[PDB]
Design a binder for this molecule. Structure first.
Ligand SMILES: CC(=O)N[C@H]1[C@H](OC[C@H]2CCC(=O)N2)O[C@H](CO)[C@@H](O)[C@@H]1O
Length: 513
């Protein structure tokens, strides 16, 4: 481990944040060490921020220009200058705090110049501000009320719902209420959004919405607009899959089977059409090593930043330098960016550590590693999950110290491939014994078995139905876990194939129900 003085010498990075956090959690950062420390933190968010703030509380921040505006309360806002009045009325809580006569007075003041403020003031003078704002079709006001409180729910007419998608807040609004199965009147109302008025993820989610109300024609039209507008081929393919499942046009499935993206939907389309398995690149460097230390986390942060910022020309130099067995994960990382994400790389590094597991287990391990870290041994996430298998410190210490009693265990042992694969195996055994499906395991590996168990206990998730289990996979309530599962499942199919232990993805989908 490294003292605060030596860390200060390193470039700002997630690795440097991780090591500062370790000092903080062990109470080794004095108040004096803590003085200049927020300029030494690459991502001042979450636990490193709460820990530093127990030592040095946040004196900021209210802008010096409006400082005087924040000396007023609901009882004295009428004594404040007009600029201060308008600044404070940015907060709906502040508006809700005001007494009704002052809302009336302020509504008049602001009607000519800030009718937005007028609408919110007078809305809060009613027993249902949302209904007042909906009647005015004040779109900005609608999203401020939604962000103030999710409990407001009301039917929205065709005119109003068609205006919502032009606001930045629309996409997360639609996603949230559809995935969480909240705001039923809002949700039902969004059946009448013209597909011409939406695109990309919003259109896709409005398709999922339509399916939940069994409006299959509307759904198809939404998914078609999504397929046309989505930027990434992976997402287009997800949308084309729905177009096919709903209307059964064989041109759609054919297009999906010919996708350059390797994902569960293109894999499935290839399987349904007797199309051959996609070509997987074979990387077999003859050179054994270079000078690079695959166990130094600071070196990875540095080289990662280089690789990410390299022009197409410097990629070629990096490619050659890292074309060794020992740096195979970095080589494939470079190649993936060099070939503008067109080729399929599915490496198996430090394979000696897993060659004795059955092949199905090898594939699940490799599938998880590929998504978690791209096999970078010193990978560190923004939540300080560590190594190839991205263990959180808590779980790493529980397995390493309590369960396995490894002598002198430290959480940084997760940076060692032998340890990452071993702990991954151990943890995957726990999850698979309870959950069975590799997809369910993936969800639980990323989101925890608690969330997974709760999701699978619901009446409406992964049961029988027309569009199952595909519909359920779109309604997994955490975005990250929804995405993670699809990607890990694709990876799993591929590695099973490479290991000569093929399984039909159609069997995987049957076993989800
Ligand atoms: C190094 C890192 O941040 N890993 C995270 C991974 O990031 C995907 C991309 C970016 C980094 C990389 O190599 N793969 O996404 C997972 C969720 O899908 C998380 O559980 C992992 O902790």
């Amino acid at each position: 481990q490294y003292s605060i003085e030596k860390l200060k010498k390193e470039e700002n990075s997630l690795a440097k944040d991780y090591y500062i956090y370790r000092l903080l959690e062990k109470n080794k950062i004095s108040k004096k060490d803590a003085q200049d420390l927020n300029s030494h933190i690459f991502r001042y968010i979450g636990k490193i921020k709460s820990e530093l703030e127990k030592i040095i509380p946040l004196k900021p921040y209210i802008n010096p220009k409006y400082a005087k505006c924040y000396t007023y309360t609901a009882n004295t806002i009428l004594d404040a200058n007009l600029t201060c009045q308008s600044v404070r009325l940015n907060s709906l809580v502040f508006i809700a705090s005001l007494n009704s006569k002052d809302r009336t007075t302020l509504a008049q003041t602001f009607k000519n110049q800030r009718p937005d403020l007028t609408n919110l003031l007078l809305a809060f003078n009613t027993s249902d501000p949302m209904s007042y704002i909906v009647q005015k079709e004040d779109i900005n006001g609608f999203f401020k009320l939604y962000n103030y409180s999710k409990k407001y729910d009301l039917d929205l007419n065709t005119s109003l719902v068609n205006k919502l998608p032009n606001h930045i807040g629309f996409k997360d609004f639609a996603q949230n209420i559809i995935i969480k199965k909240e705001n039923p009147k809002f949700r039902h109302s969004m059946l009448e959004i013209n597909p011409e008025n939406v695109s990309e993820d919003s259109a896709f989610y409005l398709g999922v919405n339509a399916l939940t109300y069994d409006k299959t024609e509307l759904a198809y039209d939404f998914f078609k607009k999504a397929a046309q507008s989505f930027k990434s081929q992976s997402n287009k393919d997800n949308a084309i899959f729905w177009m096919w499942l709903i209307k059964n046009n064989e041109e759609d499935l054919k297009t999906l089977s010919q996708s350059s993206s390797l994902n569960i939907y293109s894999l499935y389309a290839k399987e349904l059409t007797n199309t051959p398995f996609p070509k997987i690149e074979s990387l077999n460097p003859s050179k054994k090593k270079n000078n690079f230390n695959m166990q130094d986390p600071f070196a990875w942060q540095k080289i990662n930043k280089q690789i990410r910022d390299a022009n197409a020309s410097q990629l070629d130099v990096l490619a050659k330098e890292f074309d060794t067995q020992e740096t195979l994960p970095i080589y494939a990382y470079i190649l993936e960016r060099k070939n503008n994400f067109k080729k399929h790389y599915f490496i198996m590094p430090y394979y000696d550590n897993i060659k004795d597991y059955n092949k199905t287990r090898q594939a699940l391990i490799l599938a998880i590693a590929r998504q978690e870290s791209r096999f970078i041994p010193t990978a560190i996430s923004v939540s300080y999950a560590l190594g190839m298998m991205q263990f959180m410190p808590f779980l790493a210490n529980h397995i390493g110290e309590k369960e396995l009693k490894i002598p002198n265990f430290d959480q940084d042992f997760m940076f060692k491939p032998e340890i990452a694969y071993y702990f991954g195996n151990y943890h995957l055994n726990y999850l698979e014994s309870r959950l069975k499906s590799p997809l369910f395991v993936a969800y639980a590996y990323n989101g925890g078995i608690g969330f997974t168990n709760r999701m699978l206990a619901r009446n409406d998730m992964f049961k029988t139905g027309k569009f199952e289990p595909f519909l359920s996979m779109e309604l997994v309530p955490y975005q990250e876990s929804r995405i993670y599962g699809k990607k890990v499942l694709a990876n799993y199919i591929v590695y099973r194939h490479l290991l000569n232990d093929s399984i039909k993805i159609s069997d995987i989908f049957e076993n989800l129900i």
